[PDB]
């Protein structure tokens, strides 16, 4: 009779709080509801009310970006893959970017961005080897053909106050793909990791920086770019820019998610909340799916604690304890219980170690721990 | 009621008579859209995800096979938007050779003079042919040549190159076809009592043009998006071009086109704001006008008509849509239509009427029925004593 739609609900047991495949960052109903009203009638979107004409969506949120980051100007693309693309096609088409070859080795944990890169029109010079950049072999490739020198977040080394001092020696523009996206210290939470933010590197006098809007920035999908207002017009632009051009719903977003930061609404934005979920939350959560799910005969569960990647292939530093439910069952496999799982309405996916199924309580939301237990059990059942 | 600060992005009452208006956000979803797009974004979901196979899918599966029975295509893909479509087929299959265009299909391209800028810089060579307002088949056959990559076609914004026409030389020849059609209809208007010369998908594919796109938030009513549909052989080389990755659509515009192509199968045209307004009965926009002129009476120095216009409701990249409207118009004595629009445009919601010689319209074809109280309600606020 009634077809349902293709595109469901996850719930996501992986533990990966950034997970690609499951969507990357969920939204809160603060955010959507803000995106709902703008998405359900008319808007300002390109239209300047005081002067009632044509204006362009970028102005209504490019003050957010830039108090929050400290850059003279900042823009938004589509995601941070067409930032690259963007900047190198702006600065450097028919000229040199200097880069290190690890760093342009699976950009974002893609294959499709380095070559991205080599499609912008930009003539890459890869300087150093693999796992060795030293900053002699970098400060040498410069010609007077070279146009940038960049840095990609990675997935000895040249670093990023090399990058800013050989930039201002031969007066070369400097652009870091962050990749990450984060505005915040994240040692204002607990936590621990040699992650750069936008506010740091702009601080070190880094040109140009872009980030994905998705990661740990915690909006919708976006490219960030900011840095010099000089840089920055010429991106504004440049053509391509029109067919990068980011659509309302997401603007809404990150509008949204902006003022967020700002209100200091941390627990408001899904990825922080659940990155700053205590140890002890964790534990509570795993010990009641267990305890849900004794009733259920066949099956063998246990609590345990693993130190797990939650912030997905584009972030493999960040590195933080949880508490998973380990199951086995007696009749299935781990492999065809998993394969059951996906089928399920809605869909679970947990990941799997050593012939376990492992739910990884990081990512699994507390409404969700009834709906786990009564799908094992429909499933295990005849 | 809760925010320290007014967010910028804010609603607006649309009283200019355009639905396909996008300076005020192009078409508007429904509830029905909005909710599904609520769902997906509220959590986890299989975005990239082939829950059969319990590994990574590229996401327009989840939309290809709506596209391909709603236009006939043997394959489709969709990007960001149709700017990024344009730009992403000229650099996949012309990159540095030449793509045959008419003349005067390049200029003011869907009402905008940076897609013709973004081809150029796609890496074809743009071949131009005829002139302005002419184009002779004879001029475009005979710019044929073996570094001829691609025949292109655009949408308009007196002889010219037909879109059969275009298909006999792409076959003759053996080179491509792409029509930019831009406008995203997917079904024939004549079916909802309009009468247009305005090419659908469905039609475009079974005449034989080899790449048909547009935009996904003009005529088709949905997100922004650019959606790009023929042979799979050309398909699968435009998501073989690692620029796709940089034009990749998102979770909200591509959730909110699953819902959208889904209303379309089940032909629930009524739940697509842009075909539900400009399908509005005439008698019924005359309702809302006498409505609304009847809620202005009691207003000091307020002239108040209701006229009948012919208008333009497709925006300026549809500007060979006219249907007859109602619209109200007002004058004050005391305050002036500059100022008073001013005033309209920065109320609490903002009031966005057209002008003309010195009169405000409120043209009733994009005005909610719901919203005429608070055109009302504002009006004699600014208008008080």
């Known amino acids: 009779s009634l077809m349902k739609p293709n595109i469901k609900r996850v719930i996501n047991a992986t533990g990966v709080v950034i997970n690609t495949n499951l969507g ?200 960030i770019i900011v840095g010099k207002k000089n840089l920055i017009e010429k991106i504004k632009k440049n053509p391509i820019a029109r067919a990068l051009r980011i659509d309302k719903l997401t603007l809404s977003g990150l509008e949204m998610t902006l003022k967020l930061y700002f209100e200091k609404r941390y627990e408001d934005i899904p990825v922080i909340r659940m990155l700053t979920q205590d140890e002890k939350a964790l534990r509570q959560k795993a010990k009641r799916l267990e305890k849900l799910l004794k009733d259920i005969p066949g099956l063998k569960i246990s609590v345990i604690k693993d130190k797990a990647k939650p912030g997905g292939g584009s972030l493999p530093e960040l590195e933080l304890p949880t508490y998973c439910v380990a199951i086995r069952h007696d009749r299935l496999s781990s492999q065809e219980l998993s394969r059951r799982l996906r089928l399920a309405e809605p869909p679970i996916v947990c990941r799997i170690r050593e012939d376990q199924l492992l739910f990884d309580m990081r990512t699994v939301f507390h409404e969700d721990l009834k709906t786990i237990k009564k799908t094992l059990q429909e499933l295990l059942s005849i």
């Open 24 to 223: 990357r960052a969920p939204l809160s109903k603060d955010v959507i509801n803000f995106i709902s009203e703008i998405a359900n009638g008319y808007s300002n979107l390109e239209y300047n009310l005081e002067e009632g004409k044509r204006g362009s969506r970028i102005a209504h949120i490019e003050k957010y970006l830039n108090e929050l980051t400290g850059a003279e100007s900042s823009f938004v693309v589509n995601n941070n893959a067409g930032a690259v693309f963007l900047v190198l096609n702006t600065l450097a088409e028919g000229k040199e970017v200097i880069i290190s070859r690890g760093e342009l080795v699976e950009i974002g944990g893609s294959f499709r961005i380095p070559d991205i890169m080599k499609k912008s029109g930009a003539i890459l010079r890869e300087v150093g080897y693999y796992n060795k950049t030293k900053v002699s072999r970098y400060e040498g490739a410069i010609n007077q053909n070279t146009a940038l020198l960049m840095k990609v977040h990675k997935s000895e080394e040249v670093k990023l106050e090399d990058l800013v001092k050989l930039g201002h020696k031969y007066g070369i523009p400097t652009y870091y793909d962050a990749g990450s996206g984060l505005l915040i210290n994240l040692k204002e939470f607990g936590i621990s990791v040699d992650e750069p933010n936008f506010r740091d590197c702009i601080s070190l006098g880094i040109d140009l920086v872009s980030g994905s809007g998705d990661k740990l920035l915690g909006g919708p999908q976006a490219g």
